[PDB]
């Protein structure tokens, strides 16, 4: 679960918003509201 791992990374960085998308075997993650 790429998005699940990215979601924990944003929470670990003290963030309330995060984005996650998997396409063509690529992971697009983002963290905001920190």
UniProtKB/Swiss-Prot annotation:
Name used for this protein in its record: Mytilin-B
GO biological process: defense response to bacterium; defense response to virus; innate immune response; regulation of defense response to virus
Superkingdom of the source species: Eukaryota
GO cellular component: extracellular region
Membrane-spanning segments: none
Chain's role: Has antibacterial and antiviral activity.
Main location: secreted
Keywords annotated in UniProt: Antibiotic, Antimicrobial, Antiviral defense, Antiviral protein, Disulfide bond, Immunity, Innate immunity, Secreted
Disulfide bond residue pairs: 2-27, 6-29, 10-31, 15-34
Cellular localization per UniProt: Secreted
